Amino acid sequence: PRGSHMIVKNGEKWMDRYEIDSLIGKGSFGQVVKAYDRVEQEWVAIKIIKNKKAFLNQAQIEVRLLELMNKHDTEMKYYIVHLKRHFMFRNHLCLVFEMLSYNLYDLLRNTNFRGVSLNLTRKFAQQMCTALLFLATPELSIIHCDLKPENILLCNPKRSAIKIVDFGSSCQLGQRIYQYIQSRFYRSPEVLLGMPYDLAIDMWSLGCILVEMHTGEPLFSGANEVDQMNKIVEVLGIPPAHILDQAPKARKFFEKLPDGTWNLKKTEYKPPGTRKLHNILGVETGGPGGRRAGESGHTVADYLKFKDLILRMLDYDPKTRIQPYYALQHSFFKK
Numbered sequence: 559p560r561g562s563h564m565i566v567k568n569g570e571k572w573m574d575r576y577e578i579d580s581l582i583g584k585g586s587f588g589q590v591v592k593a594y595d596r597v598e599q600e601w602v603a604i605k606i607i608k609n610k611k612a613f614l615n616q617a618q619i620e621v622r623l624l625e626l627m628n629k630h631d632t633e634m635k636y637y638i639v640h641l642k643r644h645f646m647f648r649n650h651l652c653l654v655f656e657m658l659s660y661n662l663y664d665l666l667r668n669t670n671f672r673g674v675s676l677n678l679t680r681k682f683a684q685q686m687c688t689a690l691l692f693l694a695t696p697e698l699s700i701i702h703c704d705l706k707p708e709n710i711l712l713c714n715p716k717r718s719a720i721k722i723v724d725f726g727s728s729c730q731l732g733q734r735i736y737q738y739i740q741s742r743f744y745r746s747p748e749v750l751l752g753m754p755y756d757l758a759i760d761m762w763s764l765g766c767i768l769v770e771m772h773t774g775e776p777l778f779s780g781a782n783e784v785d786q787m788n789k790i791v792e793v794l795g796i797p798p799a800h801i802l803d804q805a806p807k808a809r810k811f812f813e814k815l816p817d818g819t820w821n822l823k824k825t826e827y828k829p830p831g832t833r834k835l836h837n838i839l840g841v842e843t844g845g846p847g848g849r850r851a852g853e854s855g856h857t858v859a860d861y862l863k864f865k866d867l868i869l870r871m872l873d874y875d876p877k878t879r880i881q882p883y884y885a886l887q888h889s890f891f892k893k
C-alpha cells in the first residue's frame with residue numbers, strides 16, 4: 559500500500575455500491591471523493607481518513623459527534639452536515655456525507671475578494687448563530703474548533719442556505735485534548751494563550767468570519783501565533799490583566815511591568831486598539847474599499863449594528879463574550 563493516503567482509482571465500485579467519480583479534495587485529514595451510491599441512487603461525498611493510528615482515533619470522535627448531532631431531530635439540526643453512514647475499506651475509515659455546493663471561501667473568490675453584501679452576510683450570521691445555539695444544547699455541548707470560510711458550504715449554488723462541515727477537531731465541553739486548535743486566522747485569544755476553552759471559541763471564529771465575508775479579506779491574517787496575537791491587539795488593545803495573569807503563554811506576546819500592568823513584548827505594528835473596526839468596515843466611507851457607497855442596505859445605521867454585534871463576538875473575555883441565544887436577539891437581526 560505505501561503511505562497514508564488510499565490509492566483512488568476513478569470508475570471502480572466499492573462493495574458493489576459506491577462508484578468512484580473523482581477526488582473532491584486532499585489535505586492532512588486524508589481525502590474526499592465524489593461517488594455515486596447505487597443503492598440510494600444519489601451522489602455522496604466520501605471522506606477517507608488517512609490510514610494512521612492518530613487520524614483513525616480522532617475520526618471515531620468525529621463519527622460519535624456527527625451521529626449524536628444528527629440524532630437530535632429539532633428546529634436547528636439542518637445547519638449541520640448529515641453523516642449518512644460510515645464503513646471500513648482497505649484499512650481506511652470512510653465517512654459518507656450528502657453532496658453540498660461550494661464553501662464561503664469560493665464565494666469570496668467569485669467576487670474577486672470584494673466581499674458579499676451586508677444583507678447576505680446577515681443571512682450567513684443568523685444561520686451560523688442558530689447552528690452554534692444547537693451545538694450549545696446541553697446533550698451535545700459540541701465545540702466545532704475549526705470554523706472558517708472553508709468549513710461552511712452552500713447547500714445549493716443559487717441559494718444562501720448553508721451547513722457546517724469538518725467536525726474532525728471537534729470535542730465536547732470538558733473533553734479538551736489539543737492545546738493547539740482552530741485555523742490561525744480564526745483562533746481565539748484563549749487558545750493562543752494556551753488556556754482552557756469552551757464553546758465561546760466558535761463565536762470568536764464567527765466574528766472573524768462575518769467581517770471577512772463582507773470585506774473579502776481576513777480580519778486577522780497572522781503569519782504565525784506572535785503575528786496573530788499582535789494583529790488582534792491592533793484592533794482590540796492589550797487583553798485584560800485578569801486573563802493574562804492566568805495564561806500559560808502570556809509571556810509569548812506580553813510583559814508584566816513594575817506597575818503590575820501588561821505591555822506588548824516588542825522586538826512593527828499600529829498602537830494597541832488604534833485599528834478601529836469602524837475604519838476596517840469603512841462605516842462612514844462607503845463600506846469596504848468604498849464599494850458599497852450609496853448602495854441600498856449599507857447605511858451608517860446598518861453598519862453600526864453590524865459592528866456592535868462583531869465587537870460582542872470578539873470580546874477577549876469568553877465568560878462575557880456574546881452567546882448564541884443573545885446574538886440572535888441583537889438589533890442587527892431585527893425586522
Ligand SMILES: Cc1ccc(/C=C2/C(=O)Nc3ccccc32)o1
Nearest residue numbers: 583590603655657658723724725
Ligand atoms: C465537499 C463536502 C461535502 C461534505 C463534506 C464533508 C467534509 C467534512 O465533514 N470534513 C471535510 C474536510 C474537508 C473537505 C470536506 C469535508 O465535504
